[PDB]
């Protein structure tokens, strides 16, 4: 429930309980990981663990900007991550701004957008990333990208709109900073357009809650989640780190 | 978090008390509705109000067997709230036996079994149900059925299989009850269907996770929260019912 949900601070606490009690799972890279399952809060704070980087966060939202598929349309060097899960082209399936924005995914932003104007209470208003044949799209010539973000449904309430955003699999360190940034600008954005609409709505951003099937940590970070049980610091540089996570 | 979820009995209570509060929200078709916004619990129930129904469960499950469009095809009389929603050739969205079996919705059941054989401790075993064309679908031909559940995602872990199911709307008195009859019938065919593919495996059924933007009671159930409220009965028939909901 929105009002009674965990926070940022207690998915914390449970990501280093299950560091602590190695509740390892191994990753399709074979490397461990550790989870929450079927994990639910509100976003309450913009950043689980590691440093913060406005930097990549405004590269990757031109790239969204732009709806392209590819990775080197990322701004600047793309990172080494995208290059590794592209295809052969160097083509993805998770651009978010093509997601919500190209008419090539039936215009799930503006579909939104006119369904929540022409009925505020609507259950209806949502966007929809993934799609079925995503069972077979994740691999395209050799891509391996399975959309992580599945729906993101909109509900305004008391002049406020909540979103309910549902993910399949989020890395805590990169992707709920980098996804959660994403959410907050299309949430502010549908606000925006909405009381653009009608100087009568009057509505505010309400709360993000985040729904994760798996939310997790690559081994990689573990040094970071060790160093925050041990200190309450969310942050600490490799370099700076001691441990046994090195 | 899975192990750390609401129950059923907490749901009833917050139906309650958002009932007690009047905090009320109109549906499309102009009554009254309550609802828990964002709601996660873990269905440790398989019904929140109202009287059982094995026979229209049964029913339900053989139409989704069948894969049909078509709400004729649900045996014998067919309810008139499918009746309702239909398109003037009797066709609608919402047969869950296709979203899962048909291969016109990319053969979800078959797909997810394939990945989480070849992978169990994969985070992409997911049936999707919703698709993004549905911006424009949920009303072809007259019909209103505007898809529910979005995807279906399940997660082995400790050799349990979860099943983390997220919706966009749910009403809780006959949608939870046959939903979760449905959910459960899969997990189970998931678990079984794994099972028998290798005896090494030894999986077991795990928890459901129910997340639902708009998990909500209309007006015409209001008697069953308001009796639950003050007696802690699930059930009372609308005959018997004594109170302010008539
Ligand atoms: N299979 C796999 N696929 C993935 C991710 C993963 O984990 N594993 N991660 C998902 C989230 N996307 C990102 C985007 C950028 C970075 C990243 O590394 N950012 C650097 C910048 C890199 C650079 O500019 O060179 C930073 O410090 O902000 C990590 C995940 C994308 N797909
Ligand atoms: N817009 C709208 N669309 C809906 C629902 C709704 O609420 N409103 N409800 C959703 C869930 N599906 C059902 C299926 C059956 C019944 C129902 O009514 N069942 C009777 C049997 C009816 C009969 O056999 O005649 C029973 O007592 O079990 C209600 C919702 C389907 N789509
Ligand atoms: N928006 C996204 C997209 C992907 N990922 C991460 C989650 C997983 O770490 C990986 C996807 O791997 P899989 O498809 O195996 O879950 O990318 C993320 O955190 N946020
Ligand atoms: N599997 C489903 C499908 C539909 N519904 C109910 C939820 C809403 O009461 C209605 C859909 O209306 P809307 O599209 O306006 O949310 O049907 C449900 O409970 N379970």
Redesign the interface.
């Known amino acids: 429930?929105?009002s009674?949900?965990?926070t940022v601070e207690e998915i914390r606490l449970?990501l280093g309980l299950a560091l602590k009690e190695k509740d390892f799972?191994?990753?399709?890279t074979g490397v461990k990981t550790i989870e929450?399952?079927?994990?639910?809060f509100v976003a309450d704070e913009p950043f689980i663990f590691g440093a913060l980087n406005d930097e990549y966060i405004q590269r990757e939202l031109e790239w969204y900007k732009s709806k392209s598929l590819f990775v080197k349309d990322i701004p600047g060097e793309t990172p080494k991550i995208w290059q590794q899960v592209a295809s052969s082209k160097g083509e993805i399936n998770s651009n978010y701004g093509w997601a919500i924005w190209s008419e090539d995914?039936?215009?799930?932003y503006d579909?939104?957008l006119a369904e929540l104007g022409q009925?505020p209470?609507?259950?209806?208003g949502?966007m929809?990333?993934?799609?079925?044949?995503?069972?077979?799209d994740?691999n395209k010539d050799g891509m391996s990208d399975?959309m992580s973000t599945?729906?993101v449904?909109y509900?305004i309430?008391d002049k406020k709109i909540?979103a309910?955003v549902?993910m399949?699999?989020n890395d805590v360190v990169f992707g709920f900073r980098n996804n959660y940034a994403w959410q907050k600008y299309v949430l502010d954005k549908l606000v925006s357009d909405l009381n653009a609409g009608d100087s009568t709505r009057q509505y505010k951003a309400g709360?993000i809650?985040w729904?994760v099937?798996?939310l997790?940590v690559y081994s990689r970070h573990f040094y970071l989640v060790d160093h925050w049980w041990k200190t309450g610091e969310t942050h600490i540089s490799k370099k700076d780190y001691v441990g046994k996570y090195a």
Chains 1, 2 share one sequence.
């Open positions: 429930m929105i009674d949900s965990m449970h799972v191994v990753d399709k929450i399952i079927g994990a639910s995914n039936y215009a799930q579909m939104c009925n209470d609507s259950r209806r949502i929809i990333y993934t799609r079925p044949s995503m069972q077979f994740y399975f599945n729906t449904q509900l309430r909540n309910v549902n399949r699999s709360s809650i729904n099937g798996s997790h």
